[PDB]
Amino acid sequence: MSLINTKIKPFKNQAFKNGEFIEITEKDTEGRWSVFFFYPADFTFVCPTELGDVADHYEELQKLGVDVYAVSTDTHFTHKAWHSSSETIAKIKYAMIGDPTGALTRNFDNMREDEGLADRATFVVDPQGIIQAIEVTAEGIGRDASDLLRKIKAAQYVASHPGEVCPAKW
Amino acid sequence: MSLINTKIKPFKNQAFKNGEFIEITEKDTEGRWSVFFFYPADFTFVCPTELGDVADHYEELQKLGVDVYAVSTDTHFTHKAWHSSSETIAKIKYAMIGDPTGALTRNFDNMREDEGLADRATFVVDPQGIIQAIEVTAEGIGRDASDLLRKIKAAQYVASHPGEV
Amino acid sequence: MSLINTKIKPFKNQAFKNGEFIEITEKDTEGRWSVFFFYPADFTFVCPTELGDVADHYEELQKLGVDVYAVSTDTHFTHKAWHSSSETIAKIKYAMIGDPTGALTRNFDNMREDEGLADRATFVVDPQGIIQAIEVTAEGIGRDASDLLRKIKAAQYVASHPGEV
Amino acid sequence: MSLINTKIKPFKNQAFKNGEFIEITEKDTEGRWSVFFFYPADFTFVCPTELGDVADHYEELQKLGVDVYAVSTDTHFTHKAWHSSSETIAKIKYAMIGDPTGALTRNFDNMREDEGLADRATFVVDPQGIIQAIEVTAEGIGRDASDLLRKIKAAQYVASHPGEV
Amino acid sequence: MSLINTKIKPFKNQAFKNGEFIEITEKDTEGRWSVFFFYPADFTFVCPTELGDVADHYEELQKLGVDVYAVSTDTHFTHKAWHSSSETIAKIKYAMIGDPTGALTRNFDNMREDEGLADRATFVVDPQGIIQAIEVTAEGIGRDASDLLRKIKAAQYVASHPGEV
Amino acid sequence: MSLINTKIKPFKNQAFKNGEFIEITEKDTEGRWSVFFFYPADFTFVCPTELGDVADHYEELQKLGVDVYAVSTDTHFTHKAWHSSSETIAKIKYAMIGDPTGALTRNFDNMREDEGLADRATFVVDPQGIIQAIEVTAEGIGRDASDLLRKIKAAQYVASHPGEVCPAKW
Amino acid sequence: MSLINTKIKPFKNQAFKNGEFIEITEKDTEGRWSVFFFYPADFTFVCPTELGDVADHYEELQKLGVDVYAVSTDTHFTHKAWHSSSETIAKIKYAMIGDPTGALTRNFDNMREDEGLADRATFVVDPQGIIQAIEVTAEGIGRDASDLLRKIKAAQYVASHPGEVC
Amino acid sequence: MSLINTKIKPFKNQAFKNGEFIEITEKDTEGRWSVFFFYPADFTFVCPTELGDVADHYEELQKLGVDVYAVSTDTHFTHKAWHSSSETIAKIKYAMIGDPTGALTRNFDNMREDEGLADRATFVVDPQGIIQAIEVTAEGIGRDASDLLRKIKAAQYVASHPGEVC
Amino acid sequence: MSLINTKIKPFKNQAFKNGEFIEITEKDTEGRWSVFFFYPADFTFVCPTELGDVADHYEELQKLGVDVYAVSTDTHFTHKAWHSSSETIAKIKYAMIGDPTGALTRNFDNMREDEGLADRATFVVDPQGIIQAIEVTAEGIGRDASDLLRKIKAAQYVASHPGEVC
Amino acid sequence: MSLINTKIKPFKNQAFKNGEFIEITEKDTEGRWSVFFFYPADFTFVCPTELGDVADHYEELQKLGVDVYAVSTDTHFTHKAWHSSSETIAKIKYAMIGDPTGALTRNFDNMREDEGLADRATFVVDPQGIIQAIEVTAEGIGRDASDLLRKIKAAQYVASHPGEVC
């Protein structure tokens, strides 16, 4: 009962984006490619390289018509403080969702129950709402944003053009 | 929910490796890095490009001290036949496990219940048995083996050098 | 409780028939005599003598108006492979159903839950969908097609002749 | 779920064997090959052709070390009557079990709950008590004893020969 | 508990009467006095002395307007054979019902569950279907038909002359 | 699930016998033939012919070693009053069990639940405690004590000599 | 749960009253005061002192418009015999209910389960059917009819005009 | 399910007895004849007779070896206040049990669930703990101590001389 | 399962308010600001402050459009008796709710089950019925009316001017 | 069920206190008075008036031997940033517990299920672990630290010597 190839469940979270707060819902991700990017929490000491990578590729993602959603168990208020404070997060223009309830994190089955934090999982959702790619890693282990783009471009190729690529030579 | 950072469940499946069959269990992976590579089925006319790219780097993985385990719902008899049939699969030196029951596939919650086939998923397991990297993709979307390699190296570095940077 | 003399349950399985892939259902059996021939797996070392006999008789069965359906837990892709790969299995013109879910096999209560494969069982269904003859056997036990042929002729005879002594 | 390849359940039924009345149990089958031949009822208008064939082959089966047990919902008193009354049923030297409770029949899941009679079913049990071959049929469908004979020889052959291809 | 003074339950059983078979139901006994006569089984070497004494008086019962129903767990096929076999049963002009299921036997709670046979019980039913006299005895202990006659006459008198003396 | 050929359940009732009360139990009927004779109740208008019949045969029953127990839902006190009052019951010397609880009547499944009375049922118990014969009738319909003796004599014959009487001539 | 201050459950019992049998139901106690008087059984060696007290007080109870119902597990047939037998019961004018089922005895929760008899308990029912006064005693303990009468006159007083304080 | 003849359930309630508070349990009713007297509530306008009536008899009861326990859903604080602010309740030297939990009230199945108060009941208990006599009444219907006292004398008489005849 | 922000459950209890009894329900709290003040029991030796403290503030509360409801497990009869026999409780002109059933106490999850009394809690309810402020304390620990009054002013301020910033 | 007068459930939460992170458990509150101070979240636009009041009163609380615990659903990492950011939080000397699991918030029944935040609630724990005083308020309503201090001094008084009356 994997989440691959299934519809995402509805939600209603608060987020921070470009010096102002907004309410993102399941209706906002209708008819567009979306990338839910889960991670432990704000103000940790471990380097924010993973957020910095996708921040640089956000311009390139917007050209392909792809939305990005950083999701954490911390509040939308704490995201604003972390954006004004930190060096690398200053680069973030896309939405940073606050999930104090954990409902959105629970919908993707990606909760550190005993810790109360979110695991490092990158999801790729298509316009219909079906999950096409999952990438989960533990603390310390990095995840490439260039590889994420490769999957998204591959997902958009198959979406528009089903039944692709080789059969095998005997 | 969230299979990452959990000890893998026990199993007992027959597999195919280099012209012969072998029985593999959870006691084989203890004390070694293992990579479970799930794929839908054998003899599918969608070609093995992600599988076969794993056949490459196999020297690099075995040198590094990593096991590879190809998993599918089809039998080990079909796995043997598919090895001899296609050229890309003929490069495979590592074990290819069959899950006619689906037990091992169900342990990672990676089963298409309505189709009765496994999803395209790659799991990275450590010597203890804990999972530290998961990669599941839809049909058509490939899986990069060079990216997989970096995940292994990153996992081994964090294991040997814990609580840093 | 007993399986003989009951309406077969619905299904939707993929199948392979002389080159083509097709979807077979319970609706295809309606108004026709059907023969579901279960067997463990493809590419086995066991002789396909049972399937070879049915291939020969199939000419005769099709004249009577009797369809044949080979069933196994292996996929329909592997069925095309095993047909094209080798042997007397190339004789068969009848459909070879793939049951990776095991749903069609579980409707007949004919699965090895430990092995995840189908038991050797032959069934005979009438136009109404009622089972008339059953023949389940173990590994290595042969099934005679000429014996099966007689039971089908008798089944059609009793169907057309209610009162016989 | 499947009945083939499982240990037969215990029982204590009355039986008729060439004039004598005797009590047969699961302990009598231990260390012997057994054949349970179910049939609906005695004194029917249907031809006892099936029982007549087994009567002829019984000589041969007893040399191999194979016991035969005719089973029905009618009493053991009626079995002595039907034997002594008429016909080729007088040929039989093997035991004819009476199952008025239906307990032995319900152990094989082979009863018509509406009619309160046993379905036409033949079973083959080994020294261990495991079922190897099953053959269930409907009213008017004949069962071949020579076909059954071949399956018994094959069953003993596979028992003595584990590895065969 | 206490079956007396309760309306009999519905049923549908096949029976034997004068060389032919007939289906009997609860709608046959409505508007008439009926006597259900249970006995263990056919062809039992314990002779029919209580049964056959009921064959006598049958003129007296039919004249009086009373039906007789012999009931047993054995089939109607065996009932037909037992009629031709024994001389005492050849006197029987009334219906002999078979209960292979035991349904009608279970309605009067008169079943030997461990033996799967009916007990020696006689029930007197009125036109409405209410039971007004029960007589159950153990094996060996007979049942007097002349006493049965007086019970019928006493029952008819109380029915026609209610609330007296 | 008939009571024929089954062990009787234990009980502890009060009864009246020969100008004095006594307590009968299941232990008192051990190793002896017993006849439980159920009936509606005391002081009814319907003729006590059934009690008068068995009263006359009681002497004959005592010779065969058979105990008789008249059982009703009425009390043991009411039995004494009915014995001193009525004409035919004066003849009764055997025990008249009072079953105000209905427990003994319930053990033989012979209760008029809606009426709270006992049905007319004659039971025959052997020394071991197994029920060998049952005879139940409705109000008005008589039951012969001479026929009861025939069953008891037949029961004693089979008990001492199993496997009796005819096979059939073909 | 306490049974006081509740409506009586319906019933159908046969009874005996002055040489005649009559059926009694919950309909007969409608619009009238009723006194259900339970006792163990008939023809016991215990002197019928309580029933004798209610017998001679029956004249007062009828004047107040109060019915009396002698209830027991014994049948109505036995009551008729016990009326003819003893002197103290021969002076009973009120109805004697036979309750072989127990239904009536169980409605008031007053059954000796082990003995299969009715406990000696007196109740006071009003025209509406609400139970006002309850009195239960053990075997051997007496029940005063004059005190029962006092409760009835006190019950009718409050029913006519409540409150008034002291 | 009638609790006429049964051992009383255990309890541990606080009570007011003669200018001071005390805790009393079922252990205090291990010997002696205890009498539990239930009533709705304190400071009600309804006559405080019965309680004042028993207070007169209490000296006679104490000679017989009988305890009296006035029970109510009100606290033990209110009993002392009501006793201090009374006219005929001032005579009560016996214990006045407070039952705020309602545990002791429900033990005798004597609770008005809708009102949350105790019904007007009197229970007589023997040294063994077995109940012998019961007397429940509705609002306004009194119960005299003389009839209660007679039942206690009859109860001690049957206990001391079991098995009498007539 | 914290009942900070939720609509109060319905009830129908009797209460004593200024020389007479009245029945009050949740319907009376349909408008207005109701304040439920729970306490253990009447006639306790523990200081009757808080209650006497709020009595002084009550005139100020009445101007603001605020009701006060003193709740306890004791009856409404005891409240009138305690009010008549008091020194600082005599100032209470607001309603004193009796809760013998304990229904209103359990509505706010404020019952000492083992003791059968109410805890020392204060609840502030708005016109809609939603609870805004809570204050529970142990025995001996007082709660002043001035702090309570300030919370009510803050509650009316936020209700009248929702959404403030800083 | 009311939570007042109960022992606290055990816990394991990380916290922030004066430039250093430290783990806090139920062991640390043993043998000492503790004050669990809950609030919604960090970096809100609502002025931190309540935390500022407890900050300047912290000197008194430490003199009385009372620990203060600021609890919130936000992590201990965010608390450190919020300490450096704002002035009113920069004067916080006491520990700031991070409760991302909610475990601690759920133990006291104080979770906004819909919002996923902790309600603004103050508790007063004693050396034994028994909760003595509870105070919960709605969003926008203030909590007085001087009144909290009054309750603590009253709580310590009763703990040292109970009763004494008035």
Side-chain angles (χ1 to χ4, degrees), chain E residues 106-163:
Chain E
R106 297 252 164 76
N107 294 346
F108 296 96
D109 305 358
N110 198 244
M111 174 63 84
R112 304 179 192 174
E113 295 294 340
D114 56 337
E115 295 181 37
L117 296 168
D119 286 303
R120 299 180 177 277
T122 309
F123 296 91
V124 183
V125 191
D126 81 323
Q128 282 78 335
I130 227 75
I131 302 164
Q132 307 217 110
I134 306 166
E135 184 185 343
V136 193
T137 57
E139 193 136 46
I141 299 164
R143 291 172 279 176
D144 200 344
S146 58
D147 180 47
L148 188 289
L149 270 166
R150 200 194 78 263
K151 295 267 188 73
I152 302 276
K153 291 195 186 89
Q156 288 185 348
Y157 191 92
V158 170
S160 54
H161 306 76

Side-chain angles (χ1 to χ4, degrees), chain B residues 99-113:
Chain B
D99 276 339
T101 56
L104 175 60
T105 314
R106 297 252 164 76
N107 294 346
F108 296 96
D109 305 358
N110 198 244
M111 174 63 84
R112 304 179 192 174
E113 295 294 340

Side-chain angles (χ1 to χ4, degrees), chain A residues 2 109 132 134 136 138 150 166, chain B residues 2 4 47 109 132 134 136 138 142:
Chain A
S2 182
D109 300 344
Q132 302 292 348
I134 302 108
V136 194
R150 199 209 82 260
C166 40
Chain B
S2 67
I4 192 161
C47 106
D109 305 358
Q132 307 217 110
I134 306 166
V136 193

